[PDB]
Amino acid sequence: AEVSFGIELLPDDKPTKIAHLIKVAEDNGFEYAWICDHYNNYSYMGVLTLAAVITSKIKLGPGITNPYTRHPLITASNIATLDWISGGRAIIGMGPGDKATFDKMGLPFPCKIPIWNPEAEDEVGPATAIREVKEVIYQYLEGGPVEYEGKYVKTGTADVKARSIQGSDIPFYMGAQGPIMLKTAGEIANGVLVNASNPKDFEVAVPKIEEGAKEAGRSLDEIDVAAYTCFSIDKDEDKAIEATKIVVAFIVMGSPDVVLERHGIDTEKAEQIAEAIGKGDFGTAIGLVDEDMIEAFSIAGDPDTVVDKIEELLKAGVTQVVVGSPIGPDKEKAIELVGQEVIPHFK
Amino acid sequence: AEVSFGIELLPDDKPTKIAHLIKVAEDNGFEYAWICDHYNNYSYMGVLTLAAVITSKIKLGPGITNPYTRHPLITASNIATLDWISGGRAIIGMGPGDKATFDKMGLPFPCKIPIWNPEAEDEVGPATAIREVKEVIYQYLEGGPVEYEGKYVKTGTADVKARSIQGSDIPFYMGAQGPIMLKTAGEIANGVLVNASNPKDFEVAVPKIEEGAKEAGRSLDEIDVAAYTCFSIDKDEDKAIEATKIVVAFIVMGSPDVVLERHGIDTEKAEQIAEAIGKGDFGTAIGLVDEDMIEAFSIAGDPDTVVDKIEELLKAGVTQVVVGSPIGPDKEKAIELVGQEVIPHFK
Amino acid sequence: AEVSFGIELLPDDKPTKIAHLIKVAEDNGFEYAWICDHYNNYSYMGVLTLAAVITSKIKLGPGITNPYTRHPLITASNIATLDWISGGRAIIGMGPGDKATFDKMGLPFPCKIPIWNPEAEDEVGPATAIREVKEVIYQYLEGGPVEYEGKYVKTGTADVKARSIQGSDIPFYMGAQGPIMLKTAGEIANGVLVNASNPKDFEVAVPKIEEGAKEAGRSLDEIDVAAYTCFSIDKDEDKAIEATKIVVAFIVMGSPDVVLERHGIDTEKAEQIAEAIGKGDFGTAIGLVDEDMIEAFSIAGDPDTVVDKIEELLKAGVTQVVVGSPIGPDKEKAIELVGQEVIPHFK
Amino acid sequence: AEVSFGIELLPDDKPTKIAHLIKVAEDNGFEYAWICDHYNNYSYMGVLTLAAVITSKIKLGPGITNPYTRHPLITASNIATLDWISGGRAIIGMGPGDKATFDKMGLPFPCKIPIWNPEAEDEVGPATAIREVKEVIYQYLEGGPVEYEGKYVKTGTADVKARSIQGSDIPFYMGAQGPIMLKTAGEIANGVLVNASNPKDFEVAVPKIEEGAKEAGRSLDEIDVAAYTCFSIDKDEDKAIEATKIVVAFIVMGSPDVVLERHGIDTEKAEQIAEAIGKGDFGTAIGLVDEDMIEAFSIAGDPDTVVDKIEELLKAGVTQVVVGSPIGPDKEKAIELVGQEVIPHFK
Numbered sequence A, B, C, D: 001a002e003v004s005f006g007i008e009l010l011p012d013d014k015p016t017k018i019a020h021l022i023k024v025a026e027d028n029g030f031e032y033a034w035i036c037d038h039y040n041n042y043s044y045m046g047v048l049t050l051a052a053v054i055t056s057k058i059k060l061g062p063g064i065t066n067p068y069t070r071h072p073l074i075t076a077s078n079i080a081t082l083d084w085i086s087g088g089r090a091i092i093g094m095g096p097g098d099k100a101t102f103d104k105m106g107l108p109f110p111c112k113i114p115i116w117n118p119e120a121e122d123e124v125g126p127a128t129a130i131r132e133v134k135e136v137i138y139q140y141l142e143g144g145p146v147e148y149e150g151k152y153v154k155t156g157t158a159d160v161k162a163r164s165i166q167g168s169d170i171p172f173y174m175g176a177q178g179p180i181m182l183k184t185a186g187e188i189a190n191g192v193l194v195n196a197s198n199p200k201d202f203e204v205a206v207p208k209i210e211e212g213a214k215e216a217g218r219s220l221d222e223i224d225v226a227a228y229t230c231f232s233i234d235k236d237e238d239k240a241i242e243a244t245k246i247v248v249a250f251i252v253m254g255s256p257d258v259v260l261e262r263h264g265i266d267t268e269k270a271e272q273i274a275e276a277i278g279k280g281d282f283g284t285a286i287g288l289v290d291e292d293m294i295e296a297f298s299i300a301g302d303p304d305t306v307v308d309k310i311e312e313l314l315k316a317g318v319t320q321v322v323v324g325s326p327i328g329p330d331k332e333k334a335i336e337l338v339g340q341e342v343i344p345h346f347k
């Protein structure tokens, strides 16, 4: 897979601002734009349809949605609709849901409910649910009728009228953190969205993606390994680094101990950070974030530093660098700084 | 409620055509535009967001969506997003799902699964599910956090960031056919979407809506009674009538016997029509549709005939006339004929 | 005329940012959005059409265009097109051109060329050119054919196919600074756009607008007197005031001596400012701007100060307060501060 | 130049319909969309900006605009704005104006007024005016400042802030009918828009375009020779042919005698057609159009016939086939028939 840059925006801000930033990213050479799917924010279909209207080249899609909060045939319809309206630019980001959001919604997490197979009662693994949603979506994109009986979803004979433009050429990316999801993604996905920003995370993740690819007779180069990063760039390195703190603080808090161990993180001023958060004291949280946490969980600094860090990620197997929150002290100026002083070094 | 005209479009056609027709309706004085929610067609969020971009005054919303195929917090987010993007023009159409579509999806119908309350197993009546989805949506529109524990949905503490423009002023319309849904709609809805086109249907339905309104201390005039009609208008009455046949044939097929009895329908050349359909022989189906079926199940003819029919519906309690399929031999010319020779008679 | 708030944006920034800011203004209660017409920036038709797509209620139009750089029939077409696409929200801002821009283009200023009457050679006064362009535009909006023979424009029999939505109800605002333009605007315009921010300017201008209105048998209340202001608002008054300096410096430079005299301006540290500018030394320019210049040529400060200043403008006859550059240190936060803490005081 | 298909739409219809048809063309493989520039219709900037929002791949631009009705710096701004909003898809179509429209506007035709050089009085040839407008536009697209002193336009030092995306890569197409314009286009244009639909017209035109190209050291293959055709396609050849009549009737009327001679046209039932038109009797006009006129002035018939006709045009040097009015009995179905049964034969 060729090297590319993506942008991931949480749609909590005004939809028109989110659309405007995606146009700035397109104008600056970014090739992918991912919009998160959480009920508490503006809906990905509304925000991406508005972004589709305001852009012409960048690929657009949910990053990431899930098999549970909407029937897979509804997700298929959304993707086909976004693809048609955008002139064939849709992409799919699919994951297993997320704990913080599912707890708020009232859904269990991991969610093992065979929600869309009414006659089943047996729990279903999230990786299996994702495989099934994928089959339903692509049967829909091929024009149907969709006929699928799995453990998590069982359809009737579902005819399809809506047509996309790319059809089954729409890329399927899977969110993956653990070994099971990483292996499944190497087997069935066009790409993998890994929430990580450091080469060490990919030295661990890529071999597992490759293991799944081999079992499917695929080469690792058929898979776009996308790093969903905490990213911060500014001509003033100190300012860029400072902007990452609140985000890194939350990352440190939600990182399993093997991840903290991997990055040699002060497990003391960790969780101690988790106590500052949840307590609503983000001020002490930010104060506790040190240089090792910033190096482990973000790509931050001036263009030179950022370019150096991306070179190391690419060596570790990353092929799509997704610029995520905070992006930079000023999001728009940050995107432009990436297009002007980072992307040209990788063309 | 004041008299108004709405338009209902199935989004199976190109999204840009559907958006264009909604703009033509707005330009012609229609005040509501309803887009159906069926997985087999383009998604209502994509189509309505595109229509929102291409229009400025007409109210926009799903007509009708349901409590089952998406978590109610996702439906709330969709509505708040459409409202924000449209500058405060969203409306909600909520029903219990529909048999033809749910069978295709693999969901039972009626759907009594307490889908969004994982710890519950007991069946829940569709009217109760609709009441619960309504509470969740309006808690979301008030800014949350949404905290609701019902029989069909149980949430955690769901904070909300997305903000709409109308907030809880967004109108809530309920689809209703039977006595239980009609009474529930009079109790909790700003309006009722009744799939019918004849005064006799409303002479039966309105008293039941009124019964629910009284139990909630409301006057019937607080409720917009909307007729979701089979509508066909043309300067050539014969051409208008002919265009209704395929649609009336399907209506005749899916009408319970009390409805056929109500309209004195030839129960013989009924079901005989149902056999022509399902058999894929629509040609004999159309040939069987007679004048009584057309009078019972559509508003069809030249402007004079249409105006006369609407006057009788208004006398029966209808306050919003929703022009639905086929609309007319030429949909755009039909919409214009309504704006030029029908609406001015009712202003 | 009722009290209203408008926003004026120079379209030198990204079109999507300009459109986004207009949506923020609409969401905050602004009722007018004016986009300047200068060849060096993005075109008003492109920017306003994009803004029309992203908004639903705010009125939109050029503020201000002119009779010279485009044939009046082309300007009419632009206005009818913007009106149709926006669902009947167009407004017209028409002035005589501007020296800085016309010099750059190569056109004389004042421009007295009977540009659009090929057989004429005699000079035509700008106020007469504006009267003629107005007649051509409204004949076009009435559906034509336009047939007009004046001193500045002579048409053939120009049929018109394009239709607007408001027709001749589209408001005609005239830019006016001197006595002749002010009187003409009171006679023929629905509103007047006066580049000024202080009550003293309106105590001079309003009586002249009123004189023209009386000669046309009109009451002054039929005319929307709009102040095109240098505006700066922030919760930190000092920060708001500082943001106005570069803009006030340019205003001081281009102000005729009667205006400087009117505001008791240090004519010494004036022109001395004009020498700093033109010399490219804006740093000394800003340093020279004092409190009297800021009070004379801008509405700047915290919400309390701003509200007090608007009250005095309204007493002087202003009915539309147009928030113009810089708007505030952060344009979007400034617009929101106006919607939250200024507009509600005037409702 | 590679073979491509374009679509040319007169914007007299609803802007949203024109935008929708351009999206249908894009979805069907058309690579260019041209919108005429006549004051009596909706403005090209409004219609193309709306089309830009609704499309993502097709190239968009005025086809054709002119040097006279707007200052060339305003045309430059329009093009840069359309290019930016469309994500770098703008194209320029530039011609000398047109008699029917200029007479209606009151401008002479040919228009030889040095309109934009106030100190000049000497007449300027239209080909020279087009060369000058081209220089001004590209200086603007290079970022300026534009400084140009010609016979038809003389600017001051015109700085430029607006930026396009393609910069000087935006293609410049010139409308050309006669020898002088054809030669000029071969010398200075990326393409030529020739109003003709038959191989004989191109056997005459191409050598002249080639003569200009050689004088500029260019190969004929650097020039996209675009046929602006009267086009009509339908699965029913007779229906397709019938749809061309009104349009061919007008073409026959406005064709110089050398063109009528070239196509062996009955000069009797010609002008006799011109008398039916202008007299408002289009019914006799259509009745007079014969097979030779249809063969000479349109590409009409079923897909097989159309494909055969395009093959002959390509042999005559055409490289872009522009489908123009009527397009087909049903414009949308016609566009789809071209994408499904014509374009694939030429890929």
Ligand SMILES: [Cl-]
Pocket: A045, A070, A078, B045, B070, B078
């Ligand atoms: Cl959805």
Ligand SMILES: [Cl-]
Pocket: C045, C070, C078, D045, D070, D078
């Ligand atoms: Cl223009």
Ligand SMILES: [Mg+2]
Pocket: A052, A053, A054, A055, A056, A057, D052, D053, D054, D055, D056, D057
């Ligand atoms: Mg686009």
Ligand SMILES: [Mg+2]
Pocket: B052, B053, B054, B055, B056, B057, C052, C053, C054, C055, C056, C057
């Ligand atoms: Mg709108």
